[PDB]
Each structure stands twice: as structure tokens, then as C-alpha cells.
Amino acid sequence: NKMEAKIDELINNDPVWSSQNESLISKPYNHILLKNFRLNLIVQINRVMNLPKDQLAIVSQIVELLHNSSLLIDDIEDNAPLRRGQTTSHLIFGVPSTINTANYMYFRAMQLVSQLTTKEPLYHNLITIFNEELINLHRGQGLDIYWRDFLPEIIPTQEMYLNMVMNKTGGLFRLTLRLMEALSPSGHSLVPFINLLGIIYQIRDDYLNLKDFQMGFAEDITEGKLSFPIVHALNFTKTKGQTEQHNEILRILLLRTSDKDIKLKLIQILEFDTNSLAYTKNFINQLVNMIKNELLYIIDHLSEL
Amino acid sequence: NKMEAKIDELINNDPVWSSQNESLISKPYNHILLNFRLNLIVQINRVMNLPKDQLAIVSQIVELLHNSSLLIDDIEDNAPLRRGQTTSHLIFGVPSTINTANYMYFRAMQLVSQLTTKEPLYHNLITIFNEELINLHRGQGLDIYWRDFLPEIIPTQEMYLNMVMNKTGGLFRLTLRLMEALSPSHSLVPFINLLGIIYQIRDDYLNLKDFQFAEDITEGKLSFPIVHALNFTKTKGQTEQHNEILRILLLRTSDKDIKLKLIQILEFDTNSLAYTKNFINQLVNMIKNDNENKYLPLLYIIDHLSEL
């Protein structure tokens, strides 16, 4: 009778959850927090959008949770040992706790959307925006992962790479921008521009990962990523009949090596044999010119987003 | 010129995603697809009476969240098997399987938007979805925390039960609350919470009894019988027995003999398996002997609960 009484109370109440419980499972998240530029981009865009400061703070909080959770998952998916100079959370807390915590935070971000407005129709549109772009992020990330983990089953072309980026990287840029446009009390949609910034952002990220090492650890090679320069190299070699170079690029990607000389050989194949680094540097410039023809500040600090 | 024209087209359209791209991303999910849940949904629909097309979407939502949970749980537990078959992550890799399972959570989320077009009620369905996914993750995070930090914290039966209310109760409550909010007709949440609890304890119980693979031991899980055994030995001041249980859990062992040794500790020293069997039987009687229908508004469901 005492047991049934205790069970009866348990099942007729909400689940018990303490602030101690909350802190214990937030460890992976508090850790990546230790790692303003994203705020700056939102603030600049707001000069166009004019959301009041309180609503903008909530948009920013949503973005931070989604961005940091994506990073925790990403580092697990990439077997990344370091993030911004420090040990990745999954190596400290384990893969299980980090996945669970990152996913928990996607839902906390979802929860915040309801703090943006009391108007049901608007609320509906905001959640639809949140839902669509998170679908988009997972689609792009799934393609990137598939190409990499199943190489050489699929050799993406430049067009395929760009479409994967539109989903993968464009997802969070458009999510932030679309919520703002929807909330704005105030010209043409800025979605095209934010798609371009996300593409510049990704290709420049791929580029610097190698260029910094040729002159960071070029960890994209260790991970076997189908980066923009690698995609150009693989298609260039196929096209020109450079069979051995095409096969060697694939072999080095498939080694998942941390040997620096092997990584340097691959980068110098890209520098002298396929001219992929020059091709990419020129591609980024052409993309930056499409705009330049506060914003420039952002574009020069794009790598700190 | 040409490069810019192509980029202009690209940024001005929605992201390109093909049916073939969708198939690639779906592979880890289709693998786990290869019934009793629909049965329980149908049965409960006699009280709720949602129209059939609406009941079907609830069922699809339930299948997405449940299958996605299993794909992640198997990664979180490093499980090599799920229903006798090789787990998805060992075939498609952990990376693709985490991403695909997470993608399915959001596809589930999109189906919620299709349950109704009434803005008020829609907000309610999303709030239900959101609240219970949050609870499922709090519960699973605590279950994982105890397992991975052992022996830092040893839960008591009461702490284990609150973990289960969050972890296992979330999907039971999610499905039932959506149905109750959609009903064109007393809440059954208390009843569904109790099923949830019976479900998890019997699951913990059978993992050890079927062996008597006992994978829960290899995982170092704070299962209901283990929680009982650890707290029984502590109370009875049986220091060496308490530490022996901890040592076997900490071995993350697949050795059949060592696993049997832990079970013999639970059978002969703490009598934990008989205590659990009796605990489940009592939970079940709280329903069987519910004449004045306090929880009830079945017998078959409860007897086949181990296959939800």
C-alpha cells in the first residue's frame, strides 16, 4: 500500500528533474562554450531588419545553441580531436553524452522560438522556418558525410558540392536571416546574399585549412573530406587523364592520415599538378567581387563565425 | 560572366535536393525498418476516436521517433545487435547513422504540422512534441551519466524511477498527449506513465533473465535489478559484494562466465531478480485490480509490452 501510494504519486505528476541533473548532463555543452562575431553579423543585419533588442537577443540565443550543438555533433562525425585549439567534448565526456547533450540543445533552441512572439500565425511561420532549415542542414551534412565515408563510390562534381553547401552551410545562415525577416516590423529579401555569404564562408574555410598548413594541421585531409579544392582536383585529374594522380588523391584521403609529410605531398599535388589552390583562391575572390561590386569587415573576419 | 550567372541562379533558388540524395541519407533508417505499437495506438483510439487519416500521421510520428531513438541508443550503448540483426551504425558508420537519426527527428516534427491547421491547437501539438523530446533527452542523459561516471553516483530506486519517467515515459506520454489533444471526444497520462515504467523494468529484468546475452552487463548499465543489488549490499553492510558488483560492471565485459557470476550474485546474495519480478507483478496488479477504473478508462498489451 505504501509502494502503490508512492507509484501513484509518481505517475500523477510531471517527471522529476533537478537543477543538479541539468548541470550534470550539460557538461559537453558548457565545455564548447569556452571556445561575438556571430553577434556582430546579426547586429549588422538588424540595421536592416530593426527587431527590438529583446527579440534580437532571443534570436541570437537560438543561433548559439544550434551552432554549438552542430559543432559538438560535427566533431564526433569527423573524429576531430581539437576545436579552437582545445580538446573536443566527445574525447572528454564520451561520444554518448555528447550526442545526447547536443541533441537536447536542439530542442531547447526549439523551445525558445515560442518566446519570440505571442501571435499564433507568426509563431507557426517561425517554427516552420526552424523546421525547414534544420531539415536542410541534416540533408547537406548527410551528403558530405556519405561522400567522405563511402569514397570512391561517389566523386562529387563542383555543382554537387555547391548544392550540398547550400543545404549544409546555408542552413544556419538562412535560418537566422529568415527568422529575422519574418519578425521585422519594417527592400528585397536578403536570402540570396546570405546564401552567398554561407558559400564564401565554406569554400574559404576549406581553402584556409590547406593554405595555412602549406605556409593549422590541414585536418580536413586526415578526415578525408571532399573539400572544394579536393573536388576540383579530383575532377581536373579525371578530365585530363591524370590517372595516377587521381588515384593517389583518393588513396591519401582514404588513409585518414595524420602524417604531415603525406598531407604536404597532397597539398603540393593540389598546388603544382592540378592548380586547385589557385583555382579556389580565384573562385573565392570572384564570389567576394559579386558583393563588393561593416560588410567588408564581416567578410574579412568570415573565418571567425 | 558564366560563373557568376551560375552562382546567381544557385543563390536565388531553394537548395537543390534530389530523390536520390534522399535515398542515400535514408539508408541507416531503412535498415532498422526491416505492429504492437500500432496495436496500442489503435486500442487507445477507442477512447480518443481520432479520424483515421489523422491517427495514421500520429502512427508515422511514433515510428520515426522510436526508430530514430533506437539508432542513436545503439550508438550510445555501443550495441552490436538489435533484434538479432547487426546494428545500423556498424554497417553505415556512426557518422551517417547519427545524422540520419537526427534528420528523422525533424521529419517527425514536420508531420506534426500536418495533424491540424488550427493555429491554437497546432501550437499545443508542437509544445507537447517539444516538451517530451526534452524529457526523453534528460532521462537518457542521466541514464548515460550514471553509467559513464560509475562509480561516482549510485542511484537509489527512487532516482532510477524519476529517470525512467523522463526517459521511457517521454514517447509513451508524447503519443498519448498528442492523441488527447486531438480527440474530438480523466486523462490517461497516469496510466501511460505506469505502462512506461512497467515497460522499462521488464525490459531490464528480461535482459538478465533470458541470459539466465545480458548485454546490459557488458554496457555497465544501472538497470533496475543492479540498482537494487547495489543498494541492498550497501545497506546490509556487505562491502565485498558491493564492490564485486561494481567491478564487473566496470569491466564492460562480454565474457559469459563473468556475466553469469554477476547474475549469481543477484540471484543468491541480494535476490534482486526475484525482487524485480515481484516489483513488476505489483505494478501490473495496480492495473489488473483497477475495478473502479482509476487509471484504466489491454491485458493482452501488458503481456506483450516487451515487444513495443
Ligand SMILES: CCCCCCCCCCOc1ccc[n+](CC(P(=O)(O)O)P(=O)(O)O)c1
Ligand atoms: C547570421 C549568422 C548566423 C550564424 C552563422 C553561423 C556560421 C557558421 C556556419 C557553420 O556551418 C556549418 C555546418 C556544418 C558543419 N560545420 C562545421 C565546419 P568546421 O568543422 O570547419 O568548423 P565545416 O565542416 O562546414 O567546415 C559548419
Ligand SMILES: CCCCCCCCCCOc1ccc[n+](CC(P(=O)(O)O)P(=O)(O)O)c1
Ligand atoms: C503508446 C505507444 C508509445 C510509442 C511506442 C513506445 C515504445 C517503447 C519506447 C521505449 O523508449 C525508449 C527510450 C529510451 C531507450 N529505449 C531503448 C531501450 P532498448 O535498448 O532495450 O530497446 P532501453 O535502453 O531504454 O532499455 C527505448
